[PDB]
Each structure stands twice: as C-alpha cells, then as structure tokens.
Amino acid sequence: IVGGYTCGANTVPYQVSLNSGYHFCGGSLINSQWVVSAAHCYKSGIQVRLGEDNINVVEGNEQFISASKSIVHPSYNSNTLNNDIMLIKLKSAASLNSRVASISLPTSCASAGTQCLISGWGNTKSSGTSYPDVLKCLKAPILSDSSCKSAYPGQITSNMFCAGYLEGGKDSCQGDSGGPVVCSGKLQGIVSWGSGCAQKNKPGVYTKVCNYVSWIKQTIASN
Ligand SMILES: N=C(N)c1ccc(/C=N/NC(=O)c2cccnc2)cc1
Numbered sequence: 590i591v592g593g594y595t596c597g598a599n600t601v602p603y604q605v606s607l608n609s610g611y612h613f614c615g616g617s618l619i620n621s622q623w624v625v626s627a628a629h630c631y632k633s634g635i636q637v638r639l640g641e642d643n644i645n646v647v648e649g650n651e652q653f654i655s656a657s658k659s660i661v662h663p664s665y666n667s668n669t670l671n672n673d674i675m676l677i678k679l680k681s682a683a684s685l686n687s688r689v690a691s692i693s694l695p696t697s698c699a700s701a702g703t704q705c706l707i708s709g710w711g712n713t714k715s716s717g718t719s720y721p722d723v724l725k726c727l728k729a730p731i732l733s734d735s736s737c738k739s740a741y742p743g744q745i746t747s748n749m750f751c752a753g754y755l756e757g758g759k760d761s762c763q764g765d766s767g768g769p770v771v772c773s774g775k776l777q778g779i780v781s782w783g784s785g786c787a788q789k790n791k792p793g794v795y796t797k798v799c800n801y802v803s804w805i806k807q808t809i810a811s812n
C-alpha cells in the first residue's frame with residue numbers, strides 16, 4: 590500500500606496473509622473455512638495466516654492453517670486478468686473472535702464514489718521498494734467505470750473496477766495482490782492489477798466481487 594497508514598494490530602480482522610515460506614499475497618476470510626483471494630495468487634503449498642499484524646513476529650493472535658484445496662475461477666484468464674478470483678479452503682476451521690472474523694459478501698454491487706478500505710503488506714513505495722512488516726491501510730473511493738476505462742483503454746472488463754486517486758500517490762501495490770477492498774462492511778473488491786503503483790492516471794484495478802457471489806456460494810456449498 591502506497592500513501593496509506595498503519596492500520597493498527599488486528600483492526601482488519603478478515604485480512605489474511607498467504608504464506609509459502611514467506612508472505613506472497615493477501616486474502617479475505619469469508620467464513621470459518623474459506624478465504625477469497627486473486628486467481629493470480631494461485632500456487633500449491635499455501636499456508637493461510639490469520640490474526641496477523643507484524644508478519645515477521647509472532648505476536649499472540651495468529652492462527653496458521655494449511656490450505657486443503659484451492660479453486661481458481663473456471664473462467665480466469667491470466668493474460669487479461671479477467672475473472673481474477675480464487676477460493677481457498679482451510680484444512681481446519683478458524684476459531685472466530687474479535688481479531689479473526691469473516692467479512693460479509695455483497696448483496697449488490699457498489700457505486701462509484703463509495704469509500705472503501707484497502708489493506709495489505711505490499712510495497713509502500715511508488716518509485717523504489719520497501720515492504721512493511723505491519724498491515725497497511727488506505728481509504729479510497731470507487732471510480733466511475735468511464736474514468737476507469739479511460740485510464741486503461743481496452744483492458745477494463747465488466748468484472749473489474751477502479752478505485753483510488755487519479756492524481757496518484759495513494760494506491761495498492763505489489764504484495765497487496767489478492768487482498769480486500771471493503772466498502773460499507775462488504776467485500777466489494779480484490780487487489781488485482783495496475784500499471785506501476787500510485788502513478789498519475791493509473792488507479793488500482795480490482796476484481797468486482799459482487800459478480801461472483803453466486804459462484805462463491807455454490808462452490809462453498811459443494812466443497
Ligand atoms: N497499482 C496497483 N493497484 C497494483 C499494481 C500491481 C499489482 C501487482 N503487482 N505484482 C507484481 O508487480 C509482480 C508480482 C510477482 C512477480 N512479478 C511482479 C497490484 C496492484
């Protein structure tokens with residue numbers, strides 16, 4: 590997260606770190622057994638880390654639970670990043686409490702102008718490289734589909750939205766991939782892609798979660 594703020598320990602209780610020997614992606618806990626992330630975060634041997642603040646120090650509220658299965662969206666295209674969504678099932682159910690909690694799925698899509706909270710352990714620099722140890726947060730508005738498409742001609746599908754600031758300076762970044770965009774208490778987005786980070790006229794692009802609620806529910810119901 591570039592141009593954000595320190596969230597505070599366990600203030601984002603649905604935020605997960607996906608670990609394969611090291612943090613490599615974010616995710617969002619949606620019930621005791623399931624995490625939503627980006628399809629581009631897919632890999633084998635995932636351990637889901639819940640209750641994290643400093644990802645390099647055991648602080649007392651962690652739950653580390655191995656993934657039993659991953660399900661990439663049936664229509665994920667890794668070239669265009671269309672349908673950039675994946676479900677991860679935990680080998681055992683998380684113990685849910687104030688600091689480890691699920692986030693509600695949307696029942697309708699969010700509109701341009703809605704404020705959202707985007708979070709993760711990704712790069713904090715727009716030019717160079719610096720990875721934080723503690724969770725970073727950014728409050729950002731959803732942008733109009735027209736401004737999103739203008740920013741990224743020929744690249745924005747109906748399964749994507751832009752959020753952030755056309756002026757630059759405030760954005761998600763590398764390492765935030767797969768993490769949450771939460772608006773009025775609903776998971777509306779997943780950190781998906783962008784051109785660099787926090788660049789002028791290049792806002793973050795996010796998977797449009799409201800499109801996938803039917804698929805998520807039915808997938809969970811049979812797996
Ligand atoms: N501007 C954003 N909101 C944004 C931009 C990019 C990303 C994702 N980056 N991932 C990478 O670079 C990468 C990752 C692994 C290997 N090689 C390159 C997320 C958000």
Ligand SMILES: [Ca+2]
Pocket residue numbers: 641642643644645646647648651
């Ligand atoms: Ca920790």
